[PDB]
Write a protein that binds this ligand. Structure first.
Ligand code: HEM
Ligand code: HEM
Lengths: 369, 367
């Protein structure tokens, strides 16, 4: 029996080889935030900020207050699987005299023909991902991180998301998105032999050892168009069934885990999994081994005047090198994916997320020290 | 209590009262107002409430929509979903139903501290959706909104959240984003004068209904969070740690009765004369009373770093003139809290009784 109290009592490690929020289980609530350094904040002020943030992270992730004038918003809750994760944008390095430690991996993402990016709501010197299974726990953490920045950095952009709660389903299972698709079946997983090679910078620039690169994309779903489609049309866009996430190449006996048959054909000769289906064309074996861990939140921020919902996927993917991950896959998807017609990339960020802090350290200490 | 309870718990659609009034607080909420379109009158409104009621019914039972289901809620339990419908003052002019417009829908006062967005206030129709799962909740919002079709547009829509089930070691009263214990003195079904306070007794189309007042109240968290603990506790008159009255001792808890006469060693009132939890009490307002059942909100930051965060205050009464209205008249300038909040949207809606088996909500008004 998993008790209901597990939701609050579950606690994620702050200290580790890798920062939390990469391999950590899906969380019900997320807040993504980007900060820009203030005028006259340099390396010294940035190192002080990351220390403040790390100390706050450590405390919050253990269910402990953020000091004397902790707001009490999270009081009485357990840690609720809170994680906080920190990253650095391309622009950070020229603000802090660290241009020589700027990884080539932060070179700007391509200008994809399908981009509709609000550049104000994109990019940033610093990125923080907050997730938890309790909304007060999560808001408390966002507010504490944001208040820790004080005058040394300002909020550039901030987005809210959500996922399925623990216990919503009779047994734990892969999540859904606002298209109604099963979302997360084929991620690389820890324990696979190539998982670290795919996802993390190895231990032997040196400050990124055991770090990863995240790509964030605010992707609006065109639900008004999507929801006029037949099931057959929606399933053809993905290549997997809405009911259980099994490949279209599968039988009634097929389930989520049954391997895709990418050569299966109709009586009529036509491929059962379409040639431009999203879950065909995104696979590492269709992309020279290009791979990523996808760990998103869904979003809904309202309706415009014509009733169009501002709803979609806060796409967050993780990779050792964007050029072997996000970038070549997106390059194919831009025009080549059946899904493109139904989505709109409306904001983006690429951040270097270092390894976990050890005892007595702050996140990014190797970089700033 | 197993973790699957989150999903498996089911609120009832059919009943004397609509769900979402006395129902326990939910982790996720969506509030939406609609305006009728040109060419939607009473017959179009009745069809709309029939559609909506059927969707509410299915969805509250954990079933897919009747048709064109999106699969977004598939695999999930009912997750305590509730759907609640009301009618605004303007509705009755739109549908030739002015003779059935309740007195109780007459416009709220223009409070001196109002800073109301007229475009995100009021509305012909209001729907309140809440659940403990966010995909269950979004799926319901989207289904209700798609039922509107040609009959009605979305006028405004706000998202809200609360504590999750299981977040605490055992069930406790809610907190808000000011970090206060919030809901201690909310009246409950078995308390003495509850029905008279909250429900129209069995125009007649409102029988067993209730009037809801919605206020989008921003919390001026930048100013609030620079106050000392002592100053914050003086604003409310209860402690943040445990929600006890300031008049309570070391052993006092949230439920301990407040002592409104108690003074300190220097003859000053221990619960301040303008504390919020003093001045809002029924016994300070001629018996005025309400059920409060809010959601917190956070919609991001403005350009200058100020959070668009606060309380989606939702309160329930048999008559606003014996609930929200006289209390808010008192609070407007008198309340220590008012300095750290701003009211930025408002709605007042008539929420009829719940649907019987094989009925739609609002049927006795719209037929
Ligand atoms: C809102 C936008 C998107 C939606 C709705 C969507 C939906 C899905 C779905 C339903 C699956 C199949 C189940 C699974 O394995 O998770 C999937 C797989 C995948 N998607 Fe997406 N996706 C979106 C955007 C992206 C983008 C922008 C990328 C990368 C540039 C991407 C990369 C992948 C990858 C790599 C897989 C796994 C392929 C495999 O190995 O089977 N997706 N996506
Ligand atoms: C952001 C706005 C507000 C906040 C933060 C707030 C907070 C609180 C808190 C902490 C309590 C004490 C605990 C409890 O009994 O629930 C309380 C009680 C109460 N508040 Fe509010 N409140 C707000 C707005 C309002 C408004 C607008 C009204 C009505 C006009 C209202 C009416 C009440 C009532 C009737 C009580 C219970 C009094 C009693 O009988 O003990 N509040 N509020």
């Amino acid at each position: 029996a998993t008790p209901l109290t597990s939701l609050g009592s579950e606690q994620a490690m702050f200290h580790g080889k890798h920062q939390p929020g990469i391999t950590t289980p899906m969380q019900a609530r997320g807040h993504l935030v980007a900060f820009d350094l203030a005028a006259g904040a340099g390396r010294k002020e940035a190192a002080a900020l990351l220390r403040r943030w790390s100390d706050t992270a450590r405390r919050l992730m253990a269910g402990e207050p953020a000091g004397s004038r902790d707001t009490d918003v999270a009081r009485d809750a357990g840690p609720s699987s809170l994680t906080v994760t920190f990253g650095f944008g391309h622009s950070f390095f020229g603000r802090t005299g660290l241009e020589k430690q700027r990884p080539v991996a932060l070179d700007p993402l391509p200008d994809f023909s399908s981009d509709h990016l609000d550049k104000n709501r994109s990019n940033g010197d610093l990125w923080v991902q907050i997730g938890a299974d309790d909304a007060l726990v999560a808001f408390h953490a966002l507010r504490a991180i944001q208040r820790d920045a004080g005058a040394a950095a300002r909020v550039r952009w901030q987005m809210n998301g959500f996922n399925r709660s623990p216990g919503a389903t009779a047994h734990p299972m892969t999540a859904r998105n606002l298209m109604g698709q099963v979302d997360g079946t084929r991620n690389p997983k820890p324990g696979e032999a190539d998982f670290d090679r795919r996802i993390f910078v190895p231990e032997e620039p040196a400050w990124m050892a055991n770090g990863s690169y995240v790509v964030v994309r605010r992707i609006r779903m065109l639900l008004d168009d999507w929801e006029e489609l037949s099931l057959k049309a929606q399933e053809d866009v993905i290549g997997r069934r809405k009911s259980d996430g099994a490949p279209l190449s599968g039988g009634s006996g097929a389930t989520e885990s049954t391997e895709m048959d990418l050569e299966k054909t109709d009586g009529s000769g036509e491929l059962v999994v379409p040639i431009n289906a999203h879950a065909r064309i995104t696979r590492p074996d269709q992309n020279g081994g290009a791979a990523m861990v996808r760990r998103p939140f869904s979003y809904h921020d309202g309706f415009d005047a014509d009733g169009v919902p501002d709803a979609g996927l806060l796409f967050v993917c993780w990779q050792a090198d964007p050029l072997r991950g996000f970038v070549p896959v997106q390059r194919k998807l831009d025009r080549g994916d059946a899904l493109s017609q139904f989505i709109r990339h409306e904001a983006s960020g690429l951040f270097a997320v270092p390894g976990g802090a050890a005892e007595g350290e702050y996140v990014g200490q190797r970089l700033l020290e």
